[PDB]
Amino acid sequence: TAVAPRVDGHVAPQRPEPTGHARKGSKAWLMMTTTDHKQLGIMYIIMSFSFFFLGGLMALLIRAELFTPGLQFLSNEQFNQLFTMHGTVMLLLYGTPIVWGFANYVLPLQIGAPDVAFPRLNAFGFWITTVGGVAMLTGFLTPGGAADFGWTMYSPLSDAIHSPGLGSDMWIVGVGATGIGSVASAINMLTTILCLRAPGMTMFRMPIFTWNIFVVSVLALLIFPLLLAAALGVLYDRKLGGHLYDPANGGSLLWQHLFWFFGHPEVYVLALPFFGIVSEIIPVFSRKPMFGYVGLIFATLSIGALSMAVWAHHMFVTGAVLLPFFSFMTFLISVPTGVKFFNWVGTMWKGHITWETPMIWSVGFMATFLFGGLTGIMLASPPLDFHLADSYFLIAHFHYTLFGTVVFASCAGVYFWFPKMTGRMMDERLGKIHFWLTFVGFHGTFLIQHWVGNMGMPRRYADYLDSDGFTIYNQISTVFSFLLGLSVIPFIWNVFKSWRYGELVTVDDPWGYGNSLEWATSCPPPRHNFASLPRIRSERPAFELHYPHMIERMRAEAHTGHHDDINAPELGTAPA
């Protein structure tokens, strides 16, 4: 390794300015026209969370109407529209765009890139995602309302006869446009990984988050065009009077196969990047590496593969699918998703854990997602799903999984990478208030709905009779739901305060023990990310950059075995 000659009159790069100080009119026209992955990342993130609050509104309304038996303020149509558009907003206008926002801001920094492969295509992906959001939500502006069918849009309930209103077509084209955005972002991320890496960073020196974005990018590439094709088939039936989705054609199970082939890989597309974020966060606040790094790569790759085999476990109660095939392969897709916890526990095993805010959020994620996955494997056996399918047990499952990933772990990412986005720290007092409001609210909302579903309350029920015995549980669940809704008040105020008067970050790595390469540059990064690059010889370059004396330990203790690597002779024929 060469030693560069020191030179005279050297001065370090000038650091860019933090947020809050920006002068009037600076962002307005820049937002319209920018190609910077950093601004597009921040815009993705803010847009997704805005839609998150907008969908949680509808959720609170649903929970209000279930508080007591009867239709106190909603009708039947409006309740149907409400659960439909809550689910749609939460998956396609929060989860996928926030995946791609975190990816856009962080991934070029991690690989040591200046820019993404196709910057204007990146900007197009963002703007078409926002257009899709508008297209979906404008159905409420018609007198008939939004779409009534759930976000799964079964057939023939979605055909021209059984759903005449135009809100359904608005749902269709908006979901399609969100698919367009998802694929543009995938092309960008994948090509940027393939082409623009810093010298020394091979594929097996990238962080865990980058590998996860790799696999989900190929998943999205694989699945979102199929969604668009099937949705256009539905629109073809409706506007052109086609016959492909008729029940006499077998058009119900046609739609179910096409949809869920798209659909389960989409929930894995949401899960894997936030597994990535947690794999970024925990090694920093443990002062340890990521335990089982290469095997963790193989786990992510196996999830990317197996995701295409397990699609039809959402169809056990149909009397149409091959039960043993998909039950077995569902139990198989659970195993590499289970290796994650063992790696994370190994990372924390006898480490020196500092309980900052993002670490707290990550451990809350693990605590919730463990229960979500336990619930899932019991949904994966048919003899249990025959009772639990389309019950509130299923609602409890998929909330315990999604709220673990796209909410808990996404908030962990916010608290973790707020310095790199702003050059300012967030308020830790409010951070923990937000954490505990969220924790109490979520567990008290959704934990009792397991019993509510097991007792025989189906999903998507506007009203029920008080003789059914559900009322007490719905009441407990609704009170804690309103608590969960209150959890965002300190969060919004913490982002708003800290962006504009928060504690200034003076150093390039405020947490101290940053592993990945984004912590080897300024806070915030310059326009082109890097005013200088270190040497890269590990999956944690910034750590070997900040702690030279540690490399001796970092390299020697890395394996359990007595392999005697230090005693070897000089390998190169010459240093030339």
């Binding site: 390794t1 200046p114 900007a123 091979t202 082939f261 790759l301 009397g319 091959l322 039960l323």
Partner: protein, 143 residues
């Protein structure tokens, strides 16, 4: 590129296996709780899902079989080896947002199914796509 090209062969093998298994199972395996017959949607989707990874994997393999030892894929590369021009990247452009709005017009024209709206939407789209592709080619003004 070299490492990343090999990875596409894992999913390809697996999905080819699952496609053939799914096909001859769904036509062969009897059951009480399910009907017998080849289930075409999953069949076609699994085979073309293997085809996607086969396409991209064989292309990236066929590419890396004729690329030099770049500093990116070299375990001990020095930073100074990558010095020089890196590439052209657009500093800014209005046309992505214009394309998003054009697509929005088209999509709304479909949901309402006004044919003039579909026409105008396709014109907005093709015009803005052309302007994006012609952004850095517009000749200098001449008298």
């Amino acid at each position: 590129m070299k490492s990343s090209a090999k990875l596409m062969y894992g999913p390809t093998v697996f999905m080819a296996a699952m496609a053939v298994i799914y096909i001859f199972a769904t036509m062969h395996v009897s059951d009480g709780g399910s009907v017998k017959g080849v289930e075409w949607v999953g069949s076609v989707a699994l085979v073309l899902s293997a085809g996607l990874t086969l396409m991209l994997g064989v292309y990236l393999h066929f590419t890396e079989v004729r690329v030099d030892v770049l500093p990116e894929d070299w375990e001990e590369a020095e930073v100074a080896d990558k010095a020089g021009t890196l590439g052209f990247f657009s500093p800014s452009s209005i046309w992505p947002a214009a394309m998003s709005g054009a697509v929005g017009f088209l999509a709304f024209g479909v949901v309402y199914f006004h044919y003039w709206m579909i026409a105008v939407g396709l014109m907005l789209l093709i015009f803005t796509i052309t302007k994006l592709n012609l952004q850095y080619g517009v000749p200098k003004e001449k008298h």
